[PDB]
Curated annotation (Swiss-Prot), chains A, B:
Position of the Glycyl lysine isopeptide (Lys-Gly) (interchain with G-Cter in ubiquitin) cross-link: K5, K88
Residue ranges occupied by any Peptidase C30 domain in the UniProt entry: 1-303
Effect in UniProt of substituting M47A: Does not affect ability to cleave and inactivate human TRMT1
Positions spanned in the full protein: 3264 to 3568 of 7096
This protein's name: 3C-like proteinase nsp5
Effect annotated for changing Q187A: Does not affect ability to cleave and inactivate human TRMT1
Organism per entry: Severe acute respiratory syndrome coronavirus 2
Location of the active site: H41, C143
Taxonomic path: Viruses, Riboviria, Orthornavirae, Pisuviricota, Pisoniviricetes
Compartments, as annotated in UniProt: Host cytoplasm; Host Golgi apparatus; Host nucleus
Cytoplasmic side: 1-303
Function per UniProt: Cleaves the C-terminus of replicase polyprotein at 11 sites. Recognizes substrates containing the core sequence [ILMVF]-Q-|-[SGACN]. Cleaves and inactivates human TRMT1, preventing tRNA guanine(26)-dimethylation of tRNAs. May cleave human NLRP1 in lung epithelial cells, thereby activating the NLRP1 inflammasome pathway. May cleave human GSDMD, triggering alternative GSDME-mediated epithelial cell death upon activation of the NLRP1 inflammasome, which may enhance the release interleukins 1B, 6, 16 and 18. Also able to bind an ADP-ribose-1''-phosphate (ADRP).
Reactions performed catalytically: TSAVLQ-|-SGFRK-NH2 and SGVTFQ-|-GKFKK the two peptides corresponding to the two self-cleavage sites of the SARS 3C-like proteinase are the two most reactive peptide substrates. The enzyme exhibits a strong preference for substrates containing Gln at P1 position and Leu at P2 position
Activity regulation annotation text: Inhibited by pyridone-containing alpha-ketoamides compounds 13a and 13b. In turn, alpha-ketoamide 13b (tert-butyl (1-((S)-1-(((S)-4-(benzylamino)-3,4-dioxo-1-((S)-2-oxopyrrolidin-3-yl)butan-2-yl)amino)-3-cyclopropyl-1-oxopropan-2-yl)-2-oxo-1,2-dihydropyridin-3-yl)carbamate) inhibits SARS-CoV-2 replication in human lung cells. Inhibited ex vivo by michael acceptor inhibitor N3. Inhibited ex vivo by compound 11a and 11b.
């Protein structure tokens, strides 16, 4: 029993982290096979309106210093794919895991391995917000740190860190260099859009709570999907879809509580608050656990 | 910016996890050099009053099946140190990190690598509670999972998981087999004692909040250590010591807020609640971040 914000074991990713230096800028890169991936803004000198095509044409391989621990890797090629720089190196990473690159949907969670100067610092879990920012923990030097999920022994990379926005939340790309959200790797007035709460995740966490013995929020009522969504939109929650209801199926079956029954609990909680009580140690409704996350942690999958 | 419950990178520990099987019982072991450590209750058949001296005398080396991935390790010796079994194996772990064994004080935090059948599942952070339990996330099969801190590249192991108590919290030992708290590895009526909140940690997290721009709880007042402790004891908080005040020094200096000034804020928060506001994303006062944890994450140390 118990329920914690749990990240994936990070070792397979630690073995891929390197330091990329271009000029006076240093950040992190991801070394898989004979290629190092990193944010293309490593080539900028500080930026208002950079032309990265021009900036990269003016670089050579010798301008890129890649260090894996203390061993310097020799850069033998360099190209640009969207907002990611790919540096071909002359030796393949002997620690390359089985991996793939995936672009996730908002509401999905992943583990972040925060890194500085190519050295892992810490691991934590977060979600892709509906407004395509993440609420991470990132200091200067963290650019190029990656987010990932692990299935079997395959690492699915889904995030590379590029920027902190003015509100202190974070923006980045998939491993093909495409930003999540409307953001651009430049200094402009861009800001995080209005966010919403991830309804299906909140319901997943309520199921997690029941599995762990928190039942005080349950009630005898059921609601209709349409009438629940009426309340969801009023409290700035994402609409619940039949896809979401179907995804909550296995948890609904383990606990014997129908999805629309649990929706009636969430409506009550939104309308009345918790009256000084807590759920799984929280005084607010938690929305960064997916249904998969709840089953994984409350049933026990390993990697 | 940002502030997350951050665990240490787990890879150095993943390389040490193995499966120990004795009879029909399977759990996890920790393989360092040519020794595998695991909870001694792996030799029990289910237990009301086990005599582990008798139970171990009746075992041989061949009763212990140790698997590191798929490679079976040959057990060449077996002994008992307090509540931990030590199985000498015929090959040293090639992935042994620089390590040491430490026994921590209540209020200290560590990362847990939850494991099943020798395979890492997930990593999370927790604190040793004042009542010497931890609020972990542990399913059947998790015994022998370890907790640790990492400094430089040295892993300090401080917890091995032995038991879930009736309230769903967890009990275990240091890596020398000594339980934290009064617990015993037997089936009895033992229960978690009354817990308290870790005051110095709460203050550390309030400093973390200021560093991250949450200032609404600050005020012009200061309190005396004695008058603060008067309020602490009323709300079931641990007494604040001059050692604690001194430990909060560097954070007090970075923010320019005196410890006893911050204590006045905490008194106000205990007496009045938050009035619907949050701090670092929480609606309750968080107490599982040490002062070291705050400096590490708000300043940037790596390993
Ligand atoms: N690492 C690194 C680094 C190294 C040298 C120089 C600058 C950086 C950098 C650059 C950006 C940035 C910001 C914008 Cl608005 C647009 C663009 Cl293109 C890049 C940034 O956000 N951070 C950062 C800081 C804190 C948390 N998270 C990310 C650090
Ligand atoms: N693994 C494992 C395992 C394998 C085979 C048989 C039993 C176990 C076991 C044994 C104990 C236990 C409990 C008490 Cl009260 C006293 C003693 Cl000596 C041991 C236990 O608590 N768990 C457990 C369960 C859930 C979360 N965390 C810990 C699992």
């Amino acid at each position: 029993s118990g329920f914690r914000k749990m990240a994936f074991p990070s070792g397979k990713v630690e073995g891929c982290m390197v330091q990329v230096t271009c000029g006076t800028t240093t950040l992190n890169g991801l070394w898989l096979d004979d290629v190092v991936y990193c944010p293309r803004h490593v080539i900028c000198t500080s930026m208002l309106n950079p032309n990265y095509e021009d900036l990269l044409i003016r670089k050579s391989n010798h301008n890129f210093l890649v260090q894996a621990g203390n061993v310097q890797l020799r850069v033998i090629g360099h190209s640009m794919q969207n907002c990611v720089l790919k540096l071909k190196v002359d030796t393949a990473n002997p620690k390359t895991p089985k991996y793939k690159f995936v672009r996730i949907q908002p509401g999905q969670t992943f583990s972040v391995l925060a890194c500085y100067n190519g050295s892992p610092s810490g691991v934590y879990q977060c979600a892709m917000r509906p407004n395509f920012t993440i609420k991470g923990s990132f200091l200067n030097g963290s650019c190029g740190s990656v987010g990932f999920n692990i299935d079997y022994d395959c690492v699915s990379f889904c995030y590379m860190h590029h920027m902190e926005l003015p509100t202190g939340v974070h923006a980045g790309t998939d491993l093909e260099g495409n930003f999540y959200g409307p953001f651009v790797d430049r200094q402009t007035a861009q800001a995080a859009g209005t966010d919403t709460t991830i309804t299906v995740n909140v319901l997943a966490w309520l199921y997690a709570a029941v599995i762990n013995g928190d039942r005080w929020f349950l009630n005898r009522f059921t609601t209709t999907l349409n009438d629940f969504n009426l309340v969801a939109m009023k409290y700035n929650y994402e609409p619940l879809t039949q896809d979401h209801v179907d995804i909550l199926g296995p948890l609904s079956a383990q606990t014997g509580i129908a999805v629309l029954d649990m929706c009636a609990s969430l409506k009550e909680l939104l309308q009345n608050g918790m009256n000084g009580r807590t759920i799984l140690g929280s005084a607010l409704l938690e929305d960064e656990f997916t249904p998969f996350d709840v089953v994984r942690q409350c049933s026990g999958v390993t990697f």
